[PDB]
Design a protein around this nucleic acid. Sequence first.
RNA 1: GACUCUUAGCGGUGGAUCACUCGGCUCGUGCGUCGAUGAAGAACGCAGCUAGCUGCGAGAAUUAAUGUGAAUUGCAGGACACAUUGAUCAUCGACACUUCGAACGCACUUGCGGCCCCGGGUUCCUCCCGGGGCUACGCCUGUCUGAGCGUCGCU
RNA 2: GCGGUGAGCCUUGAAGCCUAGGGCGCGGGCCCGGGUGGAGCCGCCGCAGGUGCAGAUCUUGGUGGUAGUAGCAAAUAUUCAAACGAGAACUUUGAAGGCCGAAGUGGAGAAGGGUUCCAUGUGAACAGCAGUUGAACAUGGGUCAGUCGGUCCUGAGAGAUGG
RNA 3: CCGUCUUGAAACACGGACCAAGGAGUCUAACACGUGCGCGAGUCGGGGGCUCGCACGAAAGCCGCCGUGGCGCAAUGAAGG
RNA 4: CGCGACCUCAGAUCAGACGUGGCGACCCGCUGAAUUUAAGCAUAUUAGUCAGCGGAGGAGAAGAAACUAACCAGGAUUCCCUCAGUAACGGCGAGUGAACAGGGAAGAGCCCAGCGCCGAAUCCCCGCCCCGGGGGCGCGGGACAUGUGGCGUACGGAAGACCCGCUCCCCGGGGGGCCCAAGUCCUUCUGAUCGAGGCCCCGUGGACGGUGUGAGGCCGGUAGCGGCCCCCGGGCCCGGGUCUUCCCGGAGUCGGGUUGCUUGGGAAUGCAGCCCAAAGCGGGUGGUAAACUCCAUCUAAGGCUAAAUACCGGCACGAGACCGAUAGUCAACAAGUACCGUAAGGGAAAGUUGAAAAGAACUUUGAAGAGAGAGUUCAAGAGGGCGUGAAACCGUUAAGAGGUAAACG
Lengths: 61, 204, 134, 50, 153, 135
Amino acid sequence: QTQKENLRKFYKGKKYKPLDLRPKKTRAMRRRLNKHEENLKTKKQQRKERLYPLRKYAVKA
Amino acid sequence: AVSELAGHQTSAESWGTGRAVARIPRVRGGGTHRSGQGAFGNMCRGGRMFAPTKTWRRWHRRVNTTQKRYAICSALAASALPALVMSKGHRIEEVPELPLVVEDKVEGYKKTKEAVLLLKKLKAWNDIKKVYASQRMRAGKGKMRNRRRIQRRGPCIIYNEDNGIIKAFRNIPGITLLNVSKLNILKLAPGGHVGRFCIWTESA
Amino acid sequence: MKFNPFVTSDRSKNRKRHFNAPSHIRRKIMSSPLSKELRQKYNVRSMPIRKDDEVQVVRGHYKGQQIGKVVQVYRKKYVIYIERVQREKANGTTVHVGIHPSKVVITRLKLDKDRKKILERKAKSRQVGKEKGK
Amino acid sequence: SSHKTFRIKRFLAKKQKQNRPIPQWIRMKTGNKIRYNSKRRHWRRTKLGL
Amino acid sequence: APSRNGMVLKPHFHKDWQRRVATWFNQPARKIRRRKARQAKARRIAPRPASGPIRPIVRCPTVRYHTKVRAGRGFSLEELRVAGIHKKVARTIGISVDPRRRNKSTESLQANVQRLKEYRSKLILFPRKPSAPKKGDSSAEELKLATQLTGPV
Amino acid sequence: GRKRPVPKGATYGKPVHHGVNQLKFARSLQSVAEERAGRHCGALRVLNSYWVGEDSTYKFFEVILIDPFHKAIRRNPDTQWITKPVHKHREMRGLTSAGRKSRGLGKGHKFHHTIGGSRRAAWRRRNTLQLHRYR
RNA sequence: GACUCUUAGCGGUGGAUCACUCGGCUCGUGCGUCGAUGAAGAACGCAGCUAGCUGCGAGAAUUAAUGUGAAUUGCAGGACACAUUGAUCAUCGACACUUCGAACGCACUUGCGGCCCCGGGUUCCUCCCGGGGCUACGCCUGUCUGAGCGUCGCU
RNA sequence: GCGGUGAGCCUUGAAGCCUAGGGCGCGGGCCCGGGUGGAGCCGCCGCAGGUGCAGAUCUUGGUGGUAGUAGCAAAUAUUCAAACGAGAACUUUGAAGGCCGAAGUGGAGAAGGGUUCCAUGUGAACAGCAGUUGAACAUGGGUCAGUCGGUCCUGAGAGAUGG
RNA sequence: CCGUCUUGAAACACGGACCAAGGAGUCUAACACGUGCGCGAGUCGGGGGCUCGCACGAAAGCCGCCGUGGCGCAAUGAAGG
RNA sequence: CGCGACCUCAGAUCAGACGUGGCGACCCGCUGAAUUUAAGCAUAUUAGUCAGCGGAGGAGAAGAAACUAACCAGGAUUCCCUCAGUAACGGCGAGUGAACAGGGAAGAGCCCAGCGCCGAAUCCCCGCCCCGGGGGCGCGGGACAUGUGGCGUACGGAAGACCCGCUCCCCGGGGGGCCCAAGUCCUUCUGAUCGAGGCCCCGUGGACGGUGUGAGGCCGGUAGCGGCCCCCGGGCCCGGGUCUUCCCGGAGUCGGGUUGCUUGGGAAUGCAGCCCAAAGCGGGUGGUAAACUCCAUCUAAGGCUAAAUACCGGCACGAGACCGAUAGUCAACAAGUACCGUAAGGGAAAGUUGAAAAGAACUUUGAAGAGAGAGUUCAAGAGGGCGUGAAACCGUUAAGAGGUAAACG
Ligand SMILES: [Mg+2]
Ligand SMILES: [Mg+2]
Ligand SMILES: [Mg+2]
Ligand SMILES: [Mg+2]
Ligand SMILES: [Mg+2]
Ligand SMILES: [Mg+2]
Ligand SMILES: [Mg+2]
Ligand SMILES: [Mg+2]
Ligand SMILES: [Mg+2]
Ligand SMILES: [Mg+2]
Ligand SMILES: [Mg+2]
Ligand SMILES: [Mg+2]
Ligand SMILES: [Mg+2]
Ligand SMILES: [Mg+2]
Ligand SMILES: [Mg+2]
Ligand SMILES: [Mg+2]
Ligand SMILES: [Mg+2]
Ligand SMILES: [Mg+2]
Ligand SMILES: [Mg+2]
Ligand SMILES: [Mg+2]
Ligand SMILES: [Mg+2]
Ligand SMILES: [Mg+2]
Ligand SMILES: [Mg+2]
Ligand SMILES: [Mg+2]
Ligand SMILES: [Mg+2]
Ligand SMILES: [Mg+2]
Ligand SMILES: [Mg+2]
Ligand SMILES: [Mg+2]
Ligand SMILES: [Mg+2]
Ligand SMILES: [Mg+2]
Ligand SMILES: [Mg+2]
Ligand SMILES: [Mg+2]
Ligand SMILES: [Mg+2]
Ligand SMILES: [Mg+2]
Ligand SMILES: [Mg+2]
Ligand SMILES: [Mg+2]
Ligand SMILES: [Mg+2]
Ligand SMILES: [Mg+2]
Ligand SMILES: [Mg+2]
Ligand SMILES: [Mg+2]
Ligand SMILES: [Mg+2]
Ligand SMILES: [Mg+2]
Ligand SMILES: [Mg+2]
Ligand SMILES: [Mg+2]
Ligand SMILES: [Mg+2]
Ligand SMILES: [Mg+2]
Ligand SMILES: [Mg+2]
Ligand SMILES: [Mg+2]
Ligand SMILES: [Mg+2]
Ligand SMILES: [Mg+2]
Ligand SMILES: [Mg+2]
């Protein structure tokens, strides 16, 4: 554990890590899009959402 | 339902008539007690049963709405008669009046102490003691099937709105609580016999 | 009646979760009442039995007012051994007769830091209950 | 035979280490329900798979 | 064999049917599961009217049903033009455009313009920033009547 | 066409099934092309394909593939949909433009065979027996 | 008196009946998660006394951590004052995880390599021994090194 | 088996089973006494069935008669004494008499078996009589290689890559 | 001397040594008529929806011309009708 | 006669990545029988089914009309009820057999290519520099004019003027742990009692379980919108209305022939092969082949998409008018186990001492197994395959009888 924790500190922030240091989670979960390119939106899509946002309304009876 | 595969997950063939055994199918192979012994029939040990119970039996019945409403009216009208209520076995020999109507302070009760004290003053408490006397074990295989204890049916409190009336009883053995807007023939005539003793609130 | 749809009521499932229950759950199952002096000295009604409690038997053949020290808690069989609940076998040697801890009553507790803090915890939770009598 | 491969000799080593009686202290465990080694093999009667 | 008198029956059971039987024993389970998703959606959209947008008046399309009238998929672009509201703001208001619906007649055009104008006077539009009302509604209007509408609009 | 793979032409039983020679395959030759490129290049994703000339014997197709793990593709919305796991080997589930046409999808009266979403989905629905609770 | 037959009492043989039930079956709900970071599966191994089952991987009937708070138990053993700070069980996020297996240097009812680094005998010299690391196919982007009586330019 | 109902029955003895005991019913069957047993059971009103057996060369399990019968007869053969032992036609030692008769009933291997090998101990089962014997049971032990094989080579052939 | 098939079985027709236990007209759909019930020129929610928080309750209640629809209230002609 | 561009194409244990196998209840794509029924059988039927092959997901597929209609018109997909055993198919026999409208559940819409304009305005890689990918640099590489990005897609769009309206939008409850009411009161049964009397106590808790029978009150729990504890849930930036001038679309595809399968699809519903092979006021559809002509309808040959829907596998729960050890899964147990077969594969039997081991000390006969006493226990008529212990069958005692085999009315 002391050896492995030293290696985790050595590669703290380097570009490439050993495969046994980088996280395991699940083979399918390692293939999914990460959190930055998951919510990339085009300019045609993000112009529509400033011009036409969903409004908060109510309808009286 | 029984399993769809039960009695059929064996390989079995009839032997024919050269052998001096019956023409039932027989388990194949060798080397165990199972080999060459009868299979697939309803008379064979470890075989399929006859006409295996399917899951699409018609379990449910529909009754017409006018017929269900007329069972209610016939059940409410049978519980205003002291002969039919007593013949159902209730202890109403000291009950002041049928139908018994108590007033709407009852619907806001909270504790079981004030609940039991209400039934003693209305002389509806000997009917609860016939429930305590009748607590016994069921006879039969129901005890393996989570139906171990059986008891008498007692009174039926009928209310208009809940303001605490459900929590206040709920713990007295054999007390059914019906909302008056949603009456039920399974609880106003248990066993199919008319005349459950019912206690009404004034708003109900 | 039970209203939680997540706890079961099934006879064969409650027996199964009792007969092979892990040994730290068996410790709670093998609880015992306190004496009338110790229920009002503390506020606790019942407490899981410990190696060196002093206790007396209230049911069975060894019923009496003799105080015996617990000498072994045999959680594998749900049974406890008390110093003078004995019989001799054919050899002349003497074995302890195990009795279920629901049939004894703790006449003094064997206190330490852990059995104090779980004995103040069981006293606090009643005081939250006795303020709701309004 | 006397000429055997290594992975057969090791297969035959496992089958004669499990060819053994039950210990006598097993029978005194709580919730025993076992009384002899029911799957004991004899070299003359029941041959191996191999 | 036919016995004496009766129908010539032709029962459709020659095709291994009991492998494909849809029982319905989860029917009250799914009436509860659907109902818990109506109640959950209706509190996600908290003053928005629990049932979705307004729907037009649509005449039913055959000779058997053209005396009755129902609700359609949405308002046509010609109804949106002469009620004077943009086709891309209207879903943000709860109107549900239908872009492929023609208007052949005039009094069915006018009955949905009249439905749209009567809706637009009736809905209460909260501002984007509640600290600064731009054009939406008066803050007194949003207090004693900001309730969610149940059933269809 | 598709020669039936039966030894010496002896299909067995019932002369409606005696056919060996003049039989045809259900998917098209273009769809067979898109499958063969997708099985070889398993790490790529088949987008679409087109025709570049025949022969009497052969027929040539160019197949557009996409590497789903290049960051010119994962960092572009409106093409990062093909990086989802539900689009793996989409030429073998039959849903590129070439293999879609053999399925009989479409709207209208000419396409009642697939009115649940495939031929097997329609057939399954109109051959289950709905046994309600209150029959 | 034997034998035989009938009936009863008692004794066997046998395991029906009955009672029991940590098991199924059926319906419903909620989740809906494998793998080159070596999966499923298989093999062999592992306990003081231990064969099977079960658990586990040469750290091998388990290590750490956290919650728990005095056992485990068939026998023995020595623990752990329960704060000179923790028995046991549970949880499990840290660490470990033999060989085969998509199975990855090549091969397999067997065995033989190649490359680089380190150690030992050497006392850089690379022969021997040990150790470590890499050495499969397909494919993409990029790089490097090329090939062409392919298309050309300048000479 | 389920809904009801009998202020039902029961460790002061339920079910079950047995019975030269008492009776009832045309019968299906039932009630009571006695014995055994050791924890649950039954009556009425409805409800629901995987609801009643002599047969199917029926299925599975048990058991008879046959019957202490058929049998324990292929390849010439045993005998005396002693020892151990609770016990000897069968073990061991000696003595005799014999057989295989070197294409062996001898001495070693290949396949195949898998510990049977070898000691000591047992004396239940098993070795179709019996055993003091065993290839059984228990407890221990035992297979050592530069040179003997595998390993290497190709054979009939099997088999990827390019296609 | 029983079961069985048969014009005909005590049969020199077949099956049955003996005992226990298991062992064979079921369930779904569609019809037909008969009977019981409710409503009645109508009838029926079966699907969906609404209702303290799901012990029982996966039940029960309610909707409104939600009556959409089914069957019934009109026949005949191949069809225009 | 070399040097250099590019184009085609090689080799690397090149730098960084990715695919392969499993499971497969449900889902998609293919391939695809024969038993069977027709009282024979060959078309039909079984059946687009079983088996076979491939590929997925937590759902999948489908999906924003080349649609339905013919009406006063509806308006993506999917599912339910109905349409309907109907139109239609069919040795017009057996048999098969949908759709549209109506009612519900759910509801959500969009994106390119092209045509064009914007000084390629675009993307990847590397190096350095600031935050835990962001941001900023690089006379740093490369992709790319054989076309990246913005605007923009049939619901039209753009560019101009003209009128008008402004201050934006995005991003940085669940899980686990410990606790919480009230009789071991008196009397009497019993081997023990949770029994039976008596006097209760808690109740928002009288579900169930354990405990030496049968327990609201002994113990764990149960009830409670009960408690405490721990853990998880800077970017970016105008819009609308009118008017003029322009801009407008997917080809070996449609379609036709013919062959084969398929379908309710009938002079051809879909799909495929092969030959022929387009058009632009065109093309498709308008359920009888054809010519002619009005009218309606939609815009094929590119793409994305939640919900409602399915689920005999998995993880984890809950329940039952179910079964009760020859039943229920093959498997209540050292069960896919022992064993059988070269292999593919086949495949059992087997639950119960007692509350507690108190599991019979000791004496005595025997070589031992086995007995006789003695002892444990409420009980060994519970003695280690032991609850109860039926019958067939057997031994023994008792009673009765016996040459037409017994048995029976
Ligand atoms: Mg764009
Ligand atoms: Mg019974
Ligand atoms: Mg042999
Ligand atoms: Mg809705
Ligand atoms: Mg045919
Ligand atoms: Mg086509
Ligand atoms: Mg006798
Ligand atoms: Mg038994
Ligand atoms: Mg039954
Ligand atoms: Mg019988
Ligand atoms: Mg003889
Ligand atoms: Mg001779
Ligand atoms: Mg020899
Ligand atoms: Mg020899
Ligand atoms: Mg013998
Ligand atoms: Mg020997
Ligand atoms: Mg005759
Ligand atoms: Mg006869
Ligand atoms: Mg004769
Ligand atoms: Mg015959
Ligand atoms: Mg016979
Ligand atoms: Mg029977
Ligand atoms: Mg009738
Ligand atoms: Mg795969
Ligand atoms: Mg036929
Ligand atoms: Mg026939
Ligand atoms: Mg025939
Ligand atoms: Mg077919
Ligand atoms: Mg298949
Ligand atoms: Mg999809
Ligand atoms: Mg539609
Ligand atoms: Mg009809
Ligand atoms: Mg068909
Ligand atoms: Mg462009
Ligand atoms: Mg308590
Ligand atoms: Mg109890
Ligand atoms: Mg209890
Ligand atoms: Mg057909
Ligand atoms: Mg026509
Ligand atoms: Mg799609
Ligand atoms: Mg059994
Ligand atoms: Mg048995
Ligand atoms: Mg069984
Ligand atoms: Mg039994
Ligand atoms: Mg007894
Ligand atoms: Mg007994
Ligand atoms: Mg018993
Ligand atoms: Mg027994
Ligand atoms: Mg018992
Ligand atoms: Mg017995
Ligand atoms: Mg006599």
